[PDB]
Every structure is written in C-alpha cells, then in structure tokens.
C-alpha cells in the first residue's frame, strides 16, 4: 500500500512494455487504463491472446496480485514472460501505483 515503492517497482518492471497512463500509447504491449474492472483481453489495441480473450476472469486488486506473482500461471497463454514479484507488499504496493497510475 505504498504508491511510492509501487512506482519504483513499476518504472523498472512494467514501464518496460507498458504505459499505465490514461490517453497514453500502448507500446510493446497494451495499456492498463481503468484496468481494475475490465475483463481479460478486453483492451482494444494489442492482439490479445485467446487465453486473455477467453474472458475467464476480470482484473482486480487481488487478482492482479496472483497475476503479478505468476502472470503466466494465472491466465496461461497471455503474452508476457519477464519476471513475477517476490514479496506481497511488492505486489500490493506495485498495484497501489498501477491504480493511481491508471486512474490519472
Ligand atoms: C514486456 C517484457 C512486458 C513487461 C516487462 C511487462 N508486461 Fe505486462 N504485458 C506484456 C504483454 C505483451 C502483454 C499482452 C498479453 C496479452 O494477452 O495481450 C501484457 C499484458 C499485461 C496485462 C494484461 C492486460 C489486460 O488484460 O488488461 C497486465 C495487467 C500486465 N501486463 C501487467 C504488467 C505489470 C504490472 C508489469 C510490471 C510488473 C508488466 N505487465 C510488465 C508485456 C510486458
């Protein structure tokens, strides 16, 4: 719950292939705008994978955590293989930033 350390983990983790900035520009990957609430593979832009287009679950706070600790195992098929998170606060914090970052 530290948008501060959450941002740090973001600039070095997700900023790589993301934007998480409203009215931004999805680069080397889709955006996470108003993510918390939309169904998997629902963002119009990047060619989402069938697994994400399967619409099995919806992005949320906790859902993102399990997804942040194993993005692949959560929705097998999703195009994203880099590195999951280690500690919980890393996910919560990281998610705290993804919230205020995808809200602005
Ligand atoms: C490039 C090596 C990536 C890094 C680093 C991160 N992500 Fe990513 N992410 C990437 C791709 C190519 C995709 C598309 C996969 C697909 O099925 O279309 C994604 C997707 C996501 C999503 C899902 C989008 C949605 O369904 O709304 C999320 C929530 C996401 N990525 C989060 C995320 C976070 C928090 C990262 C930093 C820890 C991160 N990604 C890094 C590619 C890459």
State how far the Cα of 19 lies from the Cα of 58, in Å rounded to an integer: 20
> Domain 1-104 maps to which CATH number in 1.10.20.10, 2.120.10.30, 1.10.760.10, 2.60.40.60?
1.10.760.10
State how far the Cα of 68 lies from the Cα of 74, in Å rounded to an integer: 9
Q: Determination method here?
A: NMR
Residue 17 per-residue DSSP state: G
Tell the residue number behind the tokens 């890393």, with chain if given: 90
State how far the Cα of 86 lies from the Cα of 47, in Å rounded to an integer: 28
Contact status, residue 26 vs residue 2, Cβ threshold 8 Å: no
What are the extents of the domains in the chain? 1-104
Q: 32-49: buried (b, 16+ CB within 10 Å) or exposed (e) per residue? A: bbebbeeebbebeebebb
Q: Is the CB of 14 under 6 A from ligand 1?
A: yes
State how far the Cα of 87 lies from the Cα of 54, in Å rounded to an integer: 29
- Using the mean position of ligand 1's atoms as its centre, give its distance from the Cα of residue 51 in Å: 13
Q: Which of 17, 19, 28 to mutate to test the pocket of ligand 1 (most atoms within 8 A of CB)?
A: 17
Closest CA to 20 of 91, 104, 89, 82: 104
Closest CA to 49 of 17, 19, 72: 72
Q: Report residue 80 as tokens.
A: 């994203």
């Amino acid at each position: 719950g530290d948008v501060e350390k959450g941002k740090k983990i973001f600039v070095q983790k997700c900023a790589q292939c993301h934007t998480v900035e409203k009215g931004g520009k999805h680069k080397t990957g889709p955006n996470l705008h108003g993510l918390f609430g939309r169904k998997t593979g629902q963002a119009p832009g990047f060619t989402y994978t069938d697994a994400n287009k399967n619409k099995g679950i919806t992005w949320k706070e906790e859902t993102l955590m399990e997804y942040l600790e194993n993005p692949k195992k959560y929705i097998p098929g999703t195009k994203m293989i880099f590195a999951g998170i280690k500690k919980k606060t890393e996910r919560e914090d990281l998610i705290a930033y993804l919230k205020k970052a995808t809200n602005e």
